[PDB]
Amino acid sequence: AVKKFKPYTPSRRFMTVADFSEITKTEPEKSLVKPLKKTGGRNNQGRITVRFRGGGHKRLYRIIDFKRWDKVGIPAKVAAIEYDPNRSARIALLHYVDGEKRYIIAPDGLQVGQQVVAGPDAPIQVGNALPLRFIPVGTVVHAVELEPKKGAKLARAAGTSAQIQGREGDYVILRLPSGELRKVHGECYATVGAVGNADHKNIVLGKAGRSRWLGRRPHVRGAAMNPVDHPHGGGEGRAPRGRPPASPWGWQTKGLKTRKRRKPSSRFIIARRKK
């Protein structure tokens, strides 16, 4: 559920927050956290290379295990599910029987007290990790590697998932969260289930301040600027765009495709995204 508020200030009227119902442990695992170097959107030259970032709550980085093929056959107990400020998904605390502890992103349905495992022989159940070639076609899966041994890259955002659609030689064919149809290699790991916290998308920030907490600084329309600044700048009074609507840097921004044409992975993308 998302949580509502009575309109006892003008902002609480529309603000909603997550319910955090799945959360069972309110403090990170000290050996699995490290400091996050906050950037402001500035690169190593000092220059802002991404606008309007800065000023959010402080965060510790929780180290996530996006490999998992790292510990084949060694099962683990799900110790706790926790809040993770670095992602929309919650994260799950794993206690391997080995004694090693790691985090994974928490799939929808994962229960604390339950066991998970990774490897070619893992049961096809929620929370387990296997190479794609061993997962029954039709099953929905998350945290997918894009190339073998290179780490989970696909379906990690709250509520996302890919579904295995079929196989072809060394590859299986997934339907990505975008609806893109892609061949991923059969040897790539993936975890059965969808990512949790699926109500994430229904949160209503509610006030300027809450974006401010997220490290999102105010964003300013090209229209509200001047010609030195932006193609849409200037003009006396309000103005329509007066040219094809553009980015600050002049490239067109309603429709112009931008994916590089001759890119090697084109050979592996079967169908571009939907809608």
Interacting residue ranges for Mg ion, rule: CB under 5 A: 4-6, 10, 13, 15, 18, 20-22, 36, 41, 48, 50-53, 56-57, 61, 84, 90, 200, 221, 223-224, 227, 235-237, 239-242, 265
Q: Does 67 bind RNA (CB under 7 A)?
A: no
CB nearer to RNA: give 120 or 213.
213
At 1, list the tokens.
């559920």
Site membership for RNA, residue 213 (CB under 7 A)? yes
- Is residue 97 a contact residue for RNA (CB under 7 A)? yes
Rounded to whole angstroms, the Cα distance separating 167 from 183 reads 8
Say if CB 147 and CB 133 are below 8 A apart. no
- The reply to whether 112 sits near RNA by the rule CB under 7 A is no
Instruction: Give the integer Cα–Cα distance in Å for 194 and 203.
Output: 19
Residues 123-162 touching RNA, rule: CB under 7 A, are 146-147, 150, 153-160
Q: Which partner from the list Mg ion, RNA, none does 236 bind, CB cut-off 5 to 8 Å by kind?
A: Mg ion
Contact 163, 155 (CB under 8 A): no
User: Choosing among RNA, Mg ion, none, which partner's interface includes residue 159 (Cβ < 5 to 8 Å by kind)?
Assistant: RNA
How many angstroms separate the CA atoms of 12 and 205, rounded? 10
CA distances for 142 relative to 53, 63, 231, angstroms: 29, 18, 41
Residues 6+ apart with CB under 8 A from 225: 232, 233, 234
Rounded to an integer, what distance in angstroms lies between the CA atom of residue 146 and that of residue 148? 7
CB atoms within 10 A of CB 211: 16
- Whether 104 and 92 have beta carbons less than 8 Å apart is answered as yes
Q: Nearest distance from residue 125's CB to Mg ion, in Å? A: 20
Structure tokens at 196: 């949790």
Alpha-carbon span 103 to 64, nearest angstrom: 5
Residue 189: CB minimum distance to RNA, A: 14
The distance of closest approach from Cβ of residue 190 to RNA in the complex, given in angstroms and rounded to an integer, is 12
**Only segment of 117-125, 126-134, 173-181, 185-193 that touches RNA (CB under 7 A):** 173-181
Q: Nearest approach, Cβ of 122 to Mg ion (angstroms)?
A: 25
Partner from RNA, Mg ion, none binding residue 125, C-beta < 5-8 Å depending on class: none
Tokens 């295990």 correspond to 65
22, interface contact from RNA, Mg ion, none, CB < 5-8 Å by kind:
Mg ion
Least separation in angstroms between residue 213's CB and Mg ion is 5
Is residue 258 part of the contact set for RNA (CB under 7 A)? yes
The CA distance from 79 to 104, in Å, is 11
Residue 134 near which of RNA, Mg ion, none (CB within 5-8 Å, type-dependent): none
167 near RNA (CB under 7 A): no
